[PDB]
């Protein structure tokens with residue numbers, strides 16, 4: 613199973629304000645949808661509440677501690693680990709937020725697909741700081757504003773150590 617975090621953030625890693633997105637960025641919404649269709653998506657309960665309904669054409673998984681919580685059109689699990697355990701056969705599970713889920717998922721994540729907006733918004737929740745020594749950039753695409761803020765799509769893949777790593781060429 614590949615664990616992938618997808619998130620949109622500003623230059624300070626801000627992702628949210630009052631349980632809403634701090635911006636409207638159509639390019640990001642198109643990107644997110646095209647990436648997530650036909651994959652299982654995992655979100656925390658507040659993010660589901662923010663979205664307000666299941667995202668169509670995808671398996672919506674919601675994490676909550678509330679044992680008797682019912683959400684039509686979503687699968688409920690009582691921990692991220694329980695969800696990941698149930699999805700063992702999936703080639704890729706996409707974690708879609710929010711801040712609490714991202715923080716918990718990051719130590720298990722293999723991949724990150726990040727939209728980074730070149731602007732500073734006002735807000736209350738952030739994407740977790742990742743260790744730049746642990747991850748390599750596999751794709752970076754910068755976009756000028758039109759989408760009224762400039763933005764980039766940055767893809768990262770988790771590494772494996774210079775001391776122990778294999779090498780591409782040998783004499």
Ligand SMILES: NC(=O)C1=CN([C@@H]2O[C@H](COP(=O)(O)OP(=O)(O)OC[C@H]3O[C@@H](n4cnc5c(N)ncnc54)[C@H](OP(=O)(O)O)[C@@H]3O)[C@@H](O)[C@H]2O)C=CC1
Nearest residue numbers: 619620627628631632656657658659677709710711712713
């Ligand atoms: N910019 C972006 O890409 C994104 C932004 N957002 C933003 O993030 C914010 C929401 O994030 P946040 O408030 O952190 O909430 P989350 O979306 O991470 O949901 C938190 C809730 O999820 C449940 N939960 C999380 N982890 C566990 C666990 N390990 N075991 C059991 N239950 C768990 C709990 O539900 P319960 O209370 O029911 O027990 C908890 O209150 C919003 O502002 C939203 O707009 C969200 C996604 C992406």
Ligand SMILES: COc1cc(Cc2cnc(N)nc2N)cc(OC)c1OC
Nearest residue numbers: 618619620632633644662663708709727
């Ligand atoms: C498709 O609509 C929404 C999607 C998301 C999650 C999300 C959106 N974009 C990116 N790049 N990563 C994510 N995890 C979060 C939302 O609100 C918190 C949405 O409602 C506007």
